[PDB]
Amino acid sequence: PEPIFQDRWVATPRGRVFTRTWETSHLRSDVPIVLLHDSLGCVDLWRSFPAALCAATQRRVIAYDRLGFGRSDACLTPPLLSFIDDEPSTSFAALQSAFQLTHFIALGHSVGGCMAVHCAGQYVEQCQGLITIAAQAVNEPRTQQGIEEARAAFQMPEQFAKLEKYHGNKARWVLNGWIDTWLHPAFEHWSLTPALQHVHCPTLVLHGENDEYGSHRQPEGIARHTRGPAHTEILPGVGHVPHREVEAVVVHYVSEFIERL
Amino acid sequence: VPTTVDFDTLCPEPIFQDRWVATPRGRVFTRTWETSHLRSDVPIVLLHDSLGCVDLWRSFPAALCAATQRRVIAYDRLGFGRSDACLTPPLLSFIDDEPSTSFAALQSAFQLTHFIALGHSVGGCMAVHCAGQYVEQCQGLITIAAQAVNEPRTQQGIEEARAAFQMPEQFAKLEKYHGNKARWVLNGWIDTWLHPAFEHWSLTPALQHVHCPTLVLHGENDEYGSHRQPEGIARHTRGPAHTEILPGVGHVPHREVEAVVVHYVSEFIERLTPGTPGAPA
C-alpha cells in the first residue's frame, strides 16, 4: 500500500537543490505532480501531504526545496525582488531539465502558487494543469498586515527556533527574504494578473475561508485572469494552510481535478 | 496570525466544554462545542426529546458545529440525563414552562442575547415556545419530528412502549442514559402525554407567535407522528417555514441520517442572513 519515495539531487549554477519523489506500486500516469512550497516552507513542512496525494492519484509526486530553502544549499545573497518571476528559470528550470519533464502538473502553496502560475505560463507546452493553494493574485492590506504580525512572533526565540528546525541556519535568510521582498515599496502595487493571463491549462483554485493573509480578492483574482478554465473551492473553516488543516479534503479535490484532465 | 511552521502538529476540531447551570430546583448540565474560526457569535441551542439527553445526541452536536462554524449548546433538562434528579413528577405544563425553566437559567447563565433553537420531538415543541417567548433573541428555529397536535398514532406508540419498557433488557437501555432517574424520565413521558389533558393539546397557539424562519424536518416513516405534524408546524408559523420530509427515516433523523440532517440545518442557518441566496435583501 504505502507509497515509496526516493531522494534525488539537482545541480544548479548557484548550488544543489533537494528533491523527494513519491510513487505507488502501480501508476495511472507517468505525468507527475510538482509541488512548489511557500515562503517559509520545504519538503519537510509538506509533512504527509505528498504521500497522501501520491496514494490518491497514483501519480508521481515531486516536491523540491528552492535553492536556499529547507534541505537545499545555502544562498548567501539576499533574494531578488524578481524571485516570483525568476522561479521558472532558476530552481524549477534545473528540476525540469534534470528530470526531463516533457509533461507535468504544477501545484503551489501561497507564494509557491504564484510561481506555479508562472511555470504554467513559461512551460505552456508541457504544463497540463495547475493547482494554487492560498496563492496571492494581488497585494492587499490583509497580506501586509499578516506578514507584519507573523514577523513579530519570530523574535520570540522559541518561535524562531521552530524555523531553524526546518531551515537550519538558513532560517535568518528565509525569514528576511520573506519580509524584505513582500513589504518592499516596489511590492506595493504588485499583481499576478500578467502571469495569470499566460496560463492556458485548466486551473484548480483552493483557498481557505479563514485565510489569515488572503481575502476573497485572491481566489477571485486567480480565476478571473486565467485564460484556461478555472474551478474554485473555498474550503470552510480552513486558514492559510489547507494541506495541513484539511489534508484529506485537499487531496480529494486535487484528485478529482486531475482525473478530469 | 500563524505560519506553515505552526502546523507540524495538529490537534483535533471541534472541541467541547462542560458547564453547570444552577436553577432553584437543582443543577443543569450543559456542553458547548466550538471551532477555532467562528462565523457568528450566535449559538445553536439544542433541546432533546422526552427520553433523550446530551449523551443521546451522540456525535450530531459536533457534526453540526463543524458544518455551521457556530457554537452548539446542548443541555440536559433538569431531571434528565446528566442533570440533578427531580423528585416531583413534571407538571402537565412542562412544554409551556420550558422557556421559563431550564432554558431560562441557560439563557441567563450564558447571557444569550441571540440564539438559534433546535428541538427534537417534544424538544422541538419547547423550541417553538422558546422561539416565540424569546421573539427578540431567536433568529432561527428548527424542529425534528416535533408534534403540532396529539394524534392516535402518537398515543399508540407510547402505549406499546410502556409495555416494552417492562422487559429488563429494555428498561436497562434507559438506565444507561439517565441512571436512577430512568423511572422518573419514563413516567414523565407516559403520564403526561397519555393524560386526558393532552388528548386535544395543540402546538398551534405557540406556533402563531413564532416570527423567525423555521426549518421543519420529519421522517417519512416516523413511528410516532403522521405527516399531519410537519404540516401543522409549517402552516401555523407566522414567519417563513420550509419542510423536508426525510425519505425512509423514522423518529430520530439526527441519529438515523446525521449528515443529511446536518446538511439541511447548516444550509438553513447560513441562508438566514439577508443578502444571501435564499433570503432576499
Residues 6+ apart with CB under 8 A from A75: A14, A15, A67, A68, A170, A173
Q: Chain B: give the shortest CA distance to residue A41, in Å.
A: 7
DSSP A4: E
Cell of A168: 537550519
Q: Which of A110, A240, A246 to mutate to test the interface with B (most CBs of B within 10 A)?
A: A240
B40 phi, psi to nearest 5 deg: -150, 155
SS3 B49: coil
In Å, what is the CA distance from A120 to each residue of A103, A104, A108, A133? 11, 9, 11, 15
Asked if A244 lies within 8 A of B7 by C-beta distance, the reply is yes
For residue B126, give every residue at least 6 positions away whose Cβ sits within 8 Å of its Cβ, in sequence order, or none. Answer: B47, B95, B98, B99, B103, B119
Q: Which domains, from first to last, does chain A contain?
A: 4-259 (3.40.50.1820)
User: Are β-strands B115-120 and B44-47 bridged in parallel, bridged antiparallel, or unpaired?
Assistant: parallel
**Distance between CA atoms of residues A134 and A244, nearest Å:** 12
Residues A133 and A115 sit within 8 Å (Cβ to Cβ): no
- Strands, E assignment, chain B: 15-23, 26-34, 44-47, 72-75, 115-120, 138-144, 214-219, 241-246
SS3 B252: coil
Task: Look up residue A192 and give its three cell numbers.
Answer: 499576478
- Tell me the residue length of chain B: 281
The answer to whether residues B91 and B102 touch, using CB atoms and an 8 Å cutoff, is no
Quick count: other Cβ atoms within 10 Å of Cβ B261? Answer: 25
Amino acid (one-letter) located at B119 = G
In a mutagenesis test of the B interface, which of A36, A37, A43, A47 is the best target, namely the one with the most B β-carbons within 10 Å? A47
User: With contact defined as beta carbons under 8 Å apart, do B156 and B223 qualify?
Assistant: no
User: Residue B268's closest CA among B216, B232, B233?
Assistant: B216
Contact A241 B5 (CB under 8 A): no
H or E segment to which residue A207 belongs: strand A203-208
3-class DSSP state for residue A180? helix
Does B12 sit behind a cis peptide bond, omega within 30 degrees of 0 on the bond before it? no
* DSSP track, A105-133: EEEEETHHHHHHHHHHHHTTTTEEEEEEE
Interface residues on A facing B, Cβ-Cβ cutoff 8 A: 38, 40-41, 45, 47, 109-110, 145-146, 149-150, 153, 159, 162-163, 166, 209-210, 212-213, 236-237, 239-241, 244-245
Chain B residues touching residue A52 (CB < 8 angstroms):
none
CB within 8 Å: B1 and A149: yes
**Cell numbers linked to B190:** 407516559
Question: Cell numbers of A208, please?
Answer: 481557505
Smallest Cα–Cα separation from A83: which of A72, A68, A70, A97? A68
Please give the grid coordinates belonging to residue A37.
512550497
Asked if B212 and B139 count as a contact pair (C-beta separation under 8 A), the reply is yes
Residue pair A222/A192 in contact (Cβ under 8 Å)? The answer is: yes
Residues from chain B that touch A40, judged by Cβ atoms under 8 A, are 3-5
Which of A210, A215, A234, A247 would best serve as a mutation to test chain B binding (most B beta carbons within 10 A)?
A210
B237 with B207: CB under 8 angstroms?
yes
Nearest to A45 among B8, B13, B36 (CB): B8
With cell 473555498, the residue in question is A234
Report chain A residues whose CB lies below 8 A from the CB of B13. 237
Asked if B2 lies within 8 A of A241 by C-beta distance, the reply is: yes
Amino acid (one-letter) located at A246: V
Separation of alpha carbons A148 and B3, rounded Å: 12
Residue A187 burial (10 A CB sphere; 0-12, 13-18, 19+)? middle
The torsion region of residue B246 among left (phi > 0), alpha (psi -120 to 50) and beta comes to beta
The DSSP code sequence of B52-117 is: --GGGGTTHHHHHHHHHTS-EEEEPPTTSTTS----SPPPTTHHHHGGGTHHHHHHHHTT-SSEEE
DSSP A42: -
Q: Which 3 state secondary structure label does DSSP give B28?
A: strand
Resolution in A: 2.7
Chain B residues in contact with A143 (beta carbon < 8 A): none
- Give CA–CA dist B21/B102, Å, rounded: 9
In angstroms, the CA B154 to CA B152 distance is: 5
C-alpha cell at A142: 490583509
- For A146, name the nearest residue in chain B, comparing CA atoms only: B1
Closest among A130, A119, A43 to A84, alpha carbons compared: A119
Q: How far apart are CA A112 and CA A106, in angstroms?
A: 10
Nearest to B69 among A47, A109, A236 (CB): A236
- What is the grid cell recorded at A149? 504580525
* Cα–Cα distance for residue pair B71/B207, rounded to 1 Å: 26
Selection from B188, B228, B209 nearest residue B93 by Cα: B188
* Method for structure elucidation: X-ray
Query: Torsions phi, psi of B137, nearest 5?
Result: -95, -25
Shortest distance, CA B12 to any CA of chain A (angstroms): 10
Count of residues making up chain A:
261
Contact predicate A145/A215, CB 8 Å: no
Q: Find chain A residues with C-beta within 8 A of B69's C-beta.
A: 236-237
- DSSP calls for B106-131: HHHHTT-SSEEEEEETHHHHHHHHHH
Q: Does residue B44 sit in helix, strand or coil? A: strand
* CA distance from start to end of chain B: 33
Selection from A115, A141, A94, A95 nearest residue A39 by Cα: A115
In chain A, which residue ranges form alpha helices assigned H by DSSP?
49-57, 83-86, 91-98, 111-122, 141-154, 157-167, 171-182, 193-196, 217-225, 242-245, 247-259
Chain A nearest-CA residue for B7: A244
Measured in angstroms, the CA of A251 and the nearest CA of chain B are apart by 17
Record: contact B1-A38, CB cut-off 8 A: no
**Neighbouring residues of B225: CB distance < 8 A, sequence distance ≥ 6:** B145, B147, B151, B153, B154, B218, B251
CB atoms within 10 A of CB A27: 14
Whether the Cβ atoms of residue B251 and residue B224 lie closer than 8 Å to each other: yes
Whose cell is 433570503? That residue is B279
Q: Do B5 and A163 touch (CB under 8 A)?
A: yes
